[PDB]
Structure 1
Amino acid sequence: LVPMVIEQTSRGERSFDIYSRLLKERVIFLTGQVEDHMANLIVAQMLFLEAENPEKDIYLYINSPGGVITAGMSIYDTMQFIKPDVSTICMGQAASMGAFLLTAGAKGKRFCLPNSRVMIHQPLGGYQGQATDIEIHAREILKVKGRMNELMALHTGQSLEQIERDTERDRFLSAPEAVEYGLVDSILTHRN
């Protein structure tokens, strides 16, 4: 059950759900396995906030175990397209897509909690059919792997070859380790 909160506005008081109240403050929650349905919902929130104030920054909280590659790309392309800077935050964990979207945030505004975890791995996929069709689908996932490693190298700042070596197998990066790798910029330990 989602709770409802009251906001003391000039034009009386209004009741908003906990998530809608934070949406008004340019805060978007990314939780659970990434999919087409939820991705189209985050895209709508990003576009709506852009209209209200393009200058103001948008905050994104990433606590997810990963998901579909295509759905995540819609969010990534939307973030780069919109003028406002998206400040990504990692709570709990950030898998392959959660980490890719995390590092995709604006330079200097990527954060992670001290006890948070990060995990980066190469894409996973499969196809059943004739050898002819297998070769086709295999070419794309290989191309997607190279495409995702190029973008991650850009944000992290590391060489393309280094990302390939690490992404070959599942790798776990702690919050301080992520700072050195370049996925995030700083850690939010306490409010200052």
Structure 2
Amino acid sequence: LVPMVIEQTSRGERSFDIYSRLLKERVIFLTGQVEDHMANLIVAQMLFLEAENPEKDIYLYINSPGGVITAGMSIYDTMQFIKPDVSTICMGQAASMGAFLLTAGAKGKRFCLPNSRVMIHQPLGGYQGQATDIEIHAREILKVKGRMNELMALHTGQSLEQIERDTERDRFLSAPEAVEYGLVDSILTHR
């Protein structure tokens, strides 16, 4: 049950849920496995905040174990498109398509908590049918794989070959190791 928090304004007092109150402060929450429905809310939230104040930065807390690759791209495409710089904070956990969004944040406004952990690996999928259909479906996984590494290399700044070999298998990176890798600029000990 989400609690209701009272917000006091000169006009009067308005009761909002805890999540809505934080949304008013440009704080979006990316929780749970990535999906189209939950991503639509994140996308819808970014557009509303961008209009209210396109200059102000938007913060996107990220505590996710990963999820659908395509759903996350909607969020990623909306972050680069809008003018507000979308800051990203990795609270608790970040995984495939959760960490990609973390590094996708604007330069100098990406952070990780001191005890946070982040993981990265290649997209996982499968298909069953005739060999001809499996070839095209399999080829698409490579296309997104190569495209994903190009984006991560762009944000992290590392060589494409380094990400390709690292992404191949699962790699658990602690918060300090992420800074060396380039996923985040520093740790959020305090502002």
Give the shorter-chain TM-score range: over 0.9
TM value normalised by structure 1: 0.98
1:163 positional shift: 0.2
Distance 1:50 1:188 in 2: 24
SS at match of 1:163: helix
Partner Cα distance (2:12, 2:148) in 1? 49
User: In the alignment, does 2:4 pair up with 1:8?
Assistant: no
Report the counterpart of residue 64 of structure 1 in structure 2. Answer: 64
Give the drift of 1:157. 0.5
Secondary structure (helix, strand or coil) at the match of 2:183 reads coil
Give CA deviations for 1:99-155 in whole Å, capped at 9, x if unaligned.
000000000000110000000000000000000100010010010000000000000
CA apart distance, 1:160? 0.1
Distance 1:10 1:37 in 2: 36
How far the C-alpha of 1:49 sits from its partner, in A, is 0.4
Q: Which runs of 4+ in 1 moved over 6 A?
A: none
The share of aligned pairs that are identical, in percent, is 100
In 2, the alpha carbon distance for the partners of 1:26 and 1:167 equals 32
* TM-score, scaled relative to structure 2: 0.99
Shift of 1:170: 0.1
Whole-angstrom CA distance in 1 between matches of 2:11 and 2:190: 35
CA deviations 1:20-47 (Å, max 9, x no partner) are: 0000000000000000000011000000
Query: What CA distance in whole angstroms lies between the structure 2 residues aligned with 1:98 and 1:136?
Result: 27
Deviation sequence 1:57-112 (CA, Å, 0-9, x none):
00000000000000000000000000010000000010011100000000000011
Matched residue count: 191
Distance 1:164 1:9 in 2: 52
Distance 1:189 1:108 in 2: 15
1:81 and 2:81 aligned: yes
Distance in 2 of aligned mates of 1:117 and 1:75: 21
Q: CA deviation at 1:188?
A: 1.1
Question: Residue 97 of structure 1: SS of its match in structure 2?
Answer: coil
The whole-number CA distance in structure 1 between the counterparts of 2:69 and 2:28 is 20
Cα shift at 1:190: 3.8
Kindly state the Cα deviation for residue 189 of structure 1 after the two structures are TM-superposed.
1.8
- The equivalent residue for 1:167 is 167
In 2, the alpha carbon distance for the partners of 1:122 and 1:9 equals: 48
3-state DSSP of counterpart to 2:118: strand
**Partners of 1:48 and 1:66 in 2: how far apart?**
25
Consecutive unaligned residues of structure 2, counting only runs of 5 or more, are none
Q: Which residue of 2 aligns with 1:46?
A: 46
CA RMSD of aligned residues (A): 0.6
Structure 1 residue 103 and structure 2 residue 92: aligned?
no
